[PDB]
Design a protein around this ligand. Structure first.
Ligand SMILES: CCCCCCCCCCCCCCCCCC(=O)OC[C@H](COP(=O)([O-])OCC(O)COP(=O)([O-])OC[C@@H](COC(=O)CCCCCCCCCCCCCCCCC)OC(=O)CCCCCCCCCCCCCCCCC)OC(=O)CCCCCCCCCCCCCCCCC
Ligand SMILES: CCCCCCCCCCCCCCCCCC(=O)OC[C@H](COP(=O)([O-])OCC[N+](C)(C)C)OC(=O)CCCCCCCCCCCCCCCCC
Ligand SMILES: CCCCCCCCCCCCCCCCCC(=O)OC[C@H](COP(=O)([O-])OCC[N+](C)(C)C)OC(=O)CCCCCCCCCCCCCCCCC
Ligand SMILES: CCCCCCCC/C=C/CCCCCCCC(=O)OC[C@H](COP(=O)(O)OCCN)OC(=O)CCCCCCC/C=C/CCCCCCCC
Ligand SMILES: CCCCCCCC/C=C/CCCCCCCC(=O)OC[C@H](COP(=O)(O)OCCN)OC(=O)CCCCCCC/C=C/CCCCCCCC
Ligand code: HEM
Ligand code: HEM
Ligand SMILES: O=C1C(=C2CCC(c3ccc(Cl)cc3)CC2)C(O)=C(O)c2ccccc21
Ligand SMILES: O=C1C(O)=C([C@H]2CC[C@H](c3ccc(Cl)cc3)CC2)C(=O)c2ccccc21
Lengths: 378, 56, 104, 45, 69, 45
């Protein structure tokens, strides 16, 4: 035998990414998982460096970041890279989800469920990093997200006070944010390995939705060079964002330190969250609002159950495709509404967008699938 | 027959992997310096009169 | 009555919109292989099995090459063969019978 | 589903009812004992 | 095998395998090729020369092969 | 070991000497280029 197959560690590597049988015909939409992994690695490295200069204390957090960006050699670009890498991470994440919704890869149940877990974990992590600078937006974001558990009817307020460690947001809460933000990424790493373990038991779905076991090619050299090309492209975009236009996504209100006595007139979270914010804004009831907020993501878990089609992929299903793109526009609409004041036109538009989101996932797609079946005479 | 440039290049340098690697390190040594100098020249030239190196 | 011609009209429209005929594929080729479908495929005679396998490989190759067949070679709506339906119906009957035994 | 409507399934469910409510008792009393839930524990002599 | 023509030829190998052992066999064959190109030694070469001597003299036995030659 | 004393091993080592010193050149120049090691790089025209 070759050494490639002489040994358990080596043979696992070989079954993973040398002699793995991959479909010949998968497209660019399948590159975004490797880019996700790359992004995780980038974040961990840049974070370990930042960590050695940051101060988890409310009387010096802000100024520690000032110190990083002004006195540490090239510290400014390390900061820039961390912040922009998070944004890239979520871009890839959203595109990665959407692929699977379009091409019917949710029928790999274990992979799909571990994906949902990973989405949740990544969001938690990103939010707990966003409050560390202790600027004016960070503070009130913390406040809202930790008051969320007050909606639990019997035990909520006590949960809030047990997470605060006191009567209010304060120094004891910031160190908790920092410990959790430190530890979560590694749990994410382990669960990613489990995710891929589950994947390699079946292999990759493909655009046509039919079995590809007659035309499998090896992962090396084809997809090795293909993914390397994808990485080069991602690095070009990331560099241009870091050096040529660093302030594109930046928010001025987080360059004012925190003031516990004043909330600013215009409130806006980080962009990858706006849509949830809009959903949360759309229900005139506290408990109902929070419930909707969490269901908006948890609803992905029952898509496999509502599947009626005989065919797996939307490639050959046009009515389906039309609905898919309408759903994507509803999400864009929620993102846009999240940016606007809480005033009447936007209130009404947001409520319609929310009802149409759930409607579409839960009702319209199942019924169009049945119509489609009937048109093909089965 | 026709001693052509790329064939000499293959036979002298690229045929053996060690020598290919050596060629690569030697090329990067000189590319780095030439490329830096060109870029710095262009940059300096785009905004003459505004950099403190010369105002000094 | 006319209603037959009308329904067949919309059905032909939907078939051309789907476009698996552009790849040289039959409808029964495009099913997802659940348990029953795999058992129906097991039951095919050799000639049908081999024809199916080649047709599918050819579609995959075209998809790899972002191309389609010449229009002259597209599958036409009026002369298609539902070769797998009969076997599938039998498989499903058998499973239904067993279920019905299991509740007594 | 529609499959699980029939005689055997009724008989089979009846077979497991007692074990079900016994595990229910176990879970309820354990929760109460673990959270010193006075609403239940104040009635224990 | 070696198969010669006037201006060209084929130089290679032929084998039969069970379907689960094609990859290993290709690996072994190409590895022997690389070995000879990079690392040959005198001791084996001597053996090969003796095998070739024996073949040449063994073939030319009887009139038919000689006429043909 | 005592096994690897003999003619074949001498011949085999001689076969690989050149590749060895070429990889040595690669490693040395790379280290120097990577650490801007002036001790070597000041002699490059
Ligand atoms: C100061 C900042 C400077 C920044 C500079 C940035 C420079 C970036 C350079 C990037 C170069 C990339 C090169 C990649 C080569 C890869 C080769 C390869 O294999 O590709 C395969 C890959 C496709 O993969 P695949 O295997 O075919 O699978 C895909 C599908 O499954 C296939 O499915 P299908 O076949 O069904 O699909 C067919 C069709 C489907 O077609 C449709 O769906 C229909 C579309 C119709 C459009 C009609 C026009 C618009 C709508 C008008 C409608 C009417 C309006 C009426 C209004 C009325 C109002 C009253 O889709 C296509 O054919 C798409 C092709 C084009 C892709 C474009 C990609 C854009 C990337 C943008 C990057 C932006 C970020 C840059 C960084 C910025 C930093 C600040 O891509 C290609 O084949 C195309 C390669 C070439 C792409 C070039 C892109 C150049 C972008 C330049 C942007 C510059 C501006 C930036 C602005 C920034 C603002 C902030
Ligand atoms: C979320 C927080 C609150 C959670 C509270 C939990 C409430 C429920 C607690 C139940 C405890 C008793 C369960 C016994 C189950 C035995 C099953 C079994 O197999 O037994 C036979 C087995 C094997 O026995 P055996 O093999 O010799 O024979 C058994 C054969 N039969 C059954 C026929 C007799 O025995 C064991 O080895 C069981 C070991 C169980 C060890 C449990 C340790 C206690 C852990 C829970 C208490 C601590 C909670 C702390 C909460 C703090 C909150 C702030
Ligand atoms: C510890 C810190 C200091 C370390 C310094 C390292 C010094 C040595 C650097 C060597 C660089 C060049 C090696 C080339 C080897 C190519 C081998 C090969 O298989 O090539 C053919 C292969 C395949 O080519 P092919 O398949 O098309 O054909 C090859 C066939 N032959 C050989 C016959 C022509 O090409 C590759 O894909 C090789 C990619 C190599 C990528 C290397 C990236 C650079 C990484 C090192 C530099 C950065 C160091 C940073 C240090 C910072 C310190 C502060
Ligand atoms: C910094 C700000 C960032 C803002 C947010 C960025 C992410 C959202 C981007 C939205 C726009 C994305 C446009 C992508 C290009 C679309 C091109 C297109 O329409 O091509 C159609 C073409 C048709 O091909 P086939 O049907 O396969 O057949 C062809 C072979 N014969 O390709 C497709 O249809 C492939 C579609 C794949 C999925 C695309 C998903 C895009 C959006 C994903 C993210 C949306 C938000 C999250 C959704 C899920 C939420 C639970
Ligand atoms: C002092 C300045 C620095 C000098 C640096 C010098 C080294 C430069 C870089 C050299 C890289 C290595 C090139 C040669 C690798 C040879 C590998 C080899 O012979 O093993 C191949 C063979 C392949 O396996 P099979 O497939 O089973 O083979 C069957 C074939 N039919 O064996 C293997 O499995 C691979 C074994 C790998 C061994 C690698 C050894 C690396 C040694 C590095 C030393 C570095 C020293 C640095 C010193 C720094 C100063 C203190
Ligand atoms: C840190 C987050 C994640 C990482 C690092 C990751 C990584 C990967 C990688 C590398 C692949 C290989 C195939 C490919 O790139 O398409 C993959 C496939 C897949 N991922 Fe994930 N993923 C993540 C999150 C998710 C999420 C959020 C979902 C779904 C909600 C998901 C569902 C899937 C599925 C279904 C596949 C296989 C689909 C197919 O092959 O057709 N993953 N993932
Ligand atoms: C999935 C992985 C990660 C994500 C998504 C993430 C995200 C973020 C975000 C969005 C910020 C705030 C950016 C800003 O305020 O401009 C941040 C800050 C920070 N993160 Fe990360 N992070 C990750 C991994 C890590 C790791 C592993 C560490 C290890 C210590 C770390 C350490 C820090 C530190 C110290 C800060 C504060 C410094 C600053 O605000 O610039 N991060 N993180
Ligand atoms: O990119 C991958 C992939 C993997 C390649 C190696 C990646 C990776 C990431 C980080 C490190 Cl340190 C090493 C390898 C992880 C993703 C993997 O397992 C698949 O199964 C797959 C299938 C289709 C298309 C692409 C892929
Ligand atoms: O009022 C808010 C608000 O409502 C949120 C919200 C946004 C959505 C978040 C969210 C929670 C859970 C999930 Cl799964 C996704 C997003 C929770 C915090 C903020 O992020 C915020 C930031 C800064 C100032 C004010 C605010």
């Amino acid at each position: 035998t070759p050494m490639r197959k002489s040994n358990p560690i080596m043979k696992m590597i070989n079954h993973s990414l040398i002699d793995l049988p991959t479909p010949s015909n998968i497209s660019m939409w399948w590159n975004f998982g490797s880019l996700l992994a790359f992004c995780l690695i980038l974040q961990i490295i840049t974070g370990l460096f930042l960590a050695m200069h940051y101060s988890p204390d409310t009387s010096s957090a802000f100024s520690s970041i000032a110190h990083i960006t002004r006195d540490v050699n090239h510290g400014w670009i390390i900061r820039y890279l961390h912040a922009n890498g998070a944004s890239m991470f979520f871009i890839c994440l959203f595109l990665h989800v959407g692929r699977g919704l379009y091409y019917g890869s949710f029928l790999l149940l274990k992979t799909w469920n571990t994906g949902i877990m990973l989405l949740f974990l990544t969001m938690a992590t990103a939010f707990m990093g966003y409050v560390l600078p202790w600027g004016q937006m960070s503070f009130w974001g913390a406040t809202v997200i930790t008051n969320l558990l007050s909606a639990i009817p019997y035990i909520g307020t006590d949960l809030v006070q047990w997470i605060w460690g006191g009567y209010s947001i304060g120094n004891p809460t910031l160190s908790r944010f920092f410990t959790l933000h430190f530890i979560l990424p590694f749990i994410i790493t382990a669960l990613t390995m489990v995710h891929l373990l589950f994947l390699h038991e079946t292999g990759s779905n493909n655009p046509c939705g039919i079995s590809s076991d007659s035309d499998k090619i090896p992962f090396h050299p084809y997809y090795t060079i293909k993914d390397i090309l994808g990485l080069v492209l991602l690095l070009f975009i990331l560099t241009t964002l870091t050096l040529l236009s660093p302030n594109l996504l930046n928010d001025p209100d987080n360059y004012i330190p925190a003031d516990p006595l004043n909330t600013p007139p215009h409130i806006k979270p980080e962009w990858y969250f706006l849509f949830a914010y809009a959903i949360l804004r759309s229900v005139p009831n506290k408990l109902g609002g929070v419930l909707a907020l969490f269901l908006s993501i948890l609803i992905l878990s029952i898509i496999p159950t509502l599947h009626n089609s005989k065919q797996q992929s939307m490639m050959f299903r046009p009515l389906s495709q039309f609905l898919f793109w309408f759903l994507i526009t509803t999400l864009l609409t929620l993102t846009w509404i999240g940016s606007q004041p809480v005033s009447q036109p936007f209130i009404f538009i947001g409520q319609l967008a929310s009802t149409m989101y759930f409607t579409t996932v839960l009702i319209l797609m199942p019924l169009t699938s049945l119509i489609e079946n009937n048109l093909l005479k089965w | 027959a026709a001693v052509a440039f790329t064939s000499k290049l293959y036979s002298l340098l690229f045929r053996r992997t060690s020598t290919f690697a050596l060629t690569i390190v030697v090329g990067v040594l000189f590319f780095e310096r030439a490329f830096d100098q060109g870029a710095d020249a262009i940059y300096d030239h785009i905004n003459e009169g505004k950099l403190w190196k010369h105002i000094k | 009555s006319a209603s037959g011609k009308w329904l067949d009209g919309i059905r032909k429209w939907y078939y051309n919109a789907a476009g698996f005929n552009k790849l040289g594929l039959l409808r029964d080729d495009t099913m997802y292989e659940d348990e029953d479908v795999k058992e129906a495929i097991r039951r095919l005679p050799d000639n049908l099995y081999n024809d199916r396998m080649f047709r599918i490989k050819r579609a995959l190759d075209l998809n790899l090459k972002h191309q389609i067949l010449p229009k002259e070679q597209w599958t036409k709506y009026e002369e298609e063969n539902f070769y797998l339906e009969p076997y599938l119906k039998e498989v499903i009957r058998e499973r239904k019978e067993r279920e019905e035994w299991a509740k007594k | 589903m529609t499959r699980f409507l029939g005689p055997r399934y009724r008989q089979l469910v009846k077979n497991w009812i007692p074990t079900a409510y016994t595990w229910g008792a176990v879970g309820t009393l354990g929760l109460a004992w673990a959270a010193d839930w006075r609403l239940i524990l104040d009635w224990v002599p | 095998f070696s198969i010669c023509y006037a201006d060209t030829g084929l130089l290679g190998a032929h084998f039969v395998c069970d379907r689960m052992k094609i990859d290993d066999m290709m690996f072994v064959l190409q590895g022997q090729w690389m070995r000879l190109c990079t690392s040959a030694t005198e001791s084996e070469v001597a053996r090969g020369k003796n095998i070739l001597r024996n073949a040449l003299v063994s073939h030319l036995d009887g009139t038919t092969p000689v006429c043909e030659d």
